[PDB]
């Protein structure tokens, strides 16, 4: 737990303003942007796949690929 296993309001808004141009988003991506850890990185992946922005083309946890909605 380096940081951000909680959501700290401005982080998800900075995600919505910083996932354009992300060709590559996943669990490890939402960790490695100096951001949300793998517990609720899955939550923000589920909540951006909830509407619009990221589109999935693979399958399971430990291995994902989600994209910009183009």
């Amino acid at each position: 737990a380096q940081h951000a296993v909680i959501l700290d309001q401005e982080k998800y808004d900075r995600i919505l303003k910083e996932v354009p141009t992300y060709r590559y988003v996943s669990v490890s991506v939402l960790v490695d942007r100096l951001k949300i850890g793998g517990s609720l990185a899955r939550i923000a992946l589920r909540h951006l796949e909830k509407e619009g922005i990221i589109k999935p083309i693979s399958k399971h946890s430990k291995q994902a690929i989600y994209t910009r909605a183009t």
């Binding site: 296993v5 909680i6 959501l7 309001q9 517990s39 609720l40 589920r46 909540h47």
Partner: protein
């Protein structure tokens, strides 16, 4: 789960059961920083206290944490079935305590301490800097003392 939007309700490090507990990680293993409440025990406390398991320690408004406090020093009072404990049929009052952070080692102490009231070979094997569970001291365990 889901994005929630929570506020200064998210509060970092707090003291429950006489020790300080880190925030923003899962309550089940936040409580395993506390002595006497193991991973199984803290998991079952977070289940039986009607607590969402998936939350952090940063969550958990005070009622659920106070009920967790109330559970951990009252095990069979809130139905922990006494196989799930560590000090069954105690040694003096004969009850079933789940002893806690500043108690469990103390009661652990008491077990070892009463050996010096009895003179059994257990305490005799304890005193010399050895292993009381009978395994060999000839070859293994060489970083010892």
């Amino acid at each position: 789960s889901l994005v929630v939007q929570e506020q200064g309700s998210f509060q970092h490090i707090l003291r429950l059961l006489n020790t300080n507990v880190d925030g923003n990680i899962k309550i089940v293993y936040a409580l395993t920083t506390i002595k006497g409440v193991g991973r199984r025990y803290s998991n079952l406390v977070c289940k039986k206290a009607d607590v969402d398991l998936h939350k952090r320690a940063g969550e958990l408004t005070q009622e659920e944490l106070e009920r967790i406090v109330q559970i951990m020093q009252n095990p069979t009072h809130y139905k922990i079935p006494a196989w799930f404990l560590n000090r069954q049929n105690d040694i003096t009052d004969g009850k079933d305590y789940h002893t806690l952070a500043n108690n469990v080692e103390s009661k652990l102490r008491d077990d070892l301490e009463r050996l010096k009231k009895i003179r059994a070979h257990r305490g005799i094997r304890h005193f010399w800097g050895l292993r009381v569970r009978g395994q060999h001291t000839k070859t293994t365990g060489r970083r010892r003392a």
